[PDB]
Amino acid sequence: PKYVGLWDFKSRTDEELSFRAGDVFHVARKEEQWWWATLLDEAGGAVAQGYVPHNYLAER
Amino acid sequence: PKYVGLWDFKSRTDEELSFRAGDVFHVARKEEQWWWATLLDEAGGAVAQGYVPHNYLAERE
Numbered sequence: 001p002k003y004v005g006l007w008d009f010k011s012r013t014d015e016e017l018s019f020r021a022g023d024v025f026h027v028a029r030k031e032e033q034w035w036w037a038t039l040l041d042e043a044g045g046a047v048a049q050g051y052v053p054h055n056y057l058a059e060r
Numbered sequence: 061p062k063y064v065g066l067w068d069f070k071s072r073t074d075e076e077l078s079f080r081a082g083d084v085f086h087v088a089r090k091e092e093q094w095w096w097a098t099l100l101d102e103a104g105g106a107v108a109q110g111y112v113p114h115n116y117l118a119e120r121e
């Protein structure tokens with residue numbers, strides 16, 4: 001979908017993208033739909049990593 | 061922050077992570093607060109790409 005910038009942003013890394021308030025962007029739906037996550041075991045320890053659907057997750 | 065899975069999920073690709081309803085996850089702000097975006101010019105043309113904090117963005121209306 002299409003988005004507008006609300007505030008100026010200064011990138012810190014080369015991969016980040018600086019912009020100004022009012023700039024317009026295209027963002028693919030997949031960026032909101034997929035999250036890299038760490039699965040925790042019953043003791044709260046990391047046991048797996050991978051992409052999971054954002055919307056299969058709820059705040060704990 | 062921590063999250064809970066609402067339904068079982070079967071990964072389709074190697075990079076996806078299978079899980080069960082009720083599993084608990086850590087998801088970093090450095091992951092989910094950022095989207096890869098394409099900056100556009102006034103004619104709708106793509107002019108730059110990179111990670112942006114998505115909460116600095118509002119859907120256009």
Ligand SMILES: [Cl-]
Nearest residue numbers: 031032054092
């Ligand atoms: Cl998101």
Ligand SMILES: [Cl-]
Nearest residue numbers: 030034051075
């Ligand atoms: Cl993906």
Ligand SMILES: [Cl-]
Nearest residue numbers: 036037050091
């Ligand atoms: Cl990653």
Ligand SMILES: [Cl-]
Nearest residue numbers: 026098105106
């Ligand atoms: Cl585009």
Ligand code: NA
Nearest residue numbers: 007008009010
């Ligand atoms: Na800023």
Ligand code: NA
Nearest residue numbers: 030031034051
């Ligand atoms: Na993705």
Ligand code: NA
Nearest residue numbers: 055056057066
């Ligand atoms: Na949901």
Ligand code: NA
Nearest residue numbers: 059061062089
């Ligand atoms: Na929050």
Ligand code: NA
Nearest residue numbers: 066067068081
């Ligand atoms: Na289920």
Ligand code: NA
Nearest residue numbers: 068069070071
């Ligand atoms: Na599934």
Ligand code: NA
Nearest residue numbers: 034051073076
């Ligand atoms: Na994926």
Ligand code: NA
Nearest residue numbers: 050074075076
């Ligand atoms: Na996997």
Ligand code: NA
Nearest residue numbers: 091092094095
């Ligand atoms: Na992200």
Ligand code: NA
Nearest residue numbers: 026098106109
């Ligand atoms: Na693009």
Ligand code: NA
Nearest residue numbers: 101102103104
């Ligand atoms: Na113009």
Ligand code: NA
Nearest residue numbers: 093114115116
């Ligand atoms: Na938000």
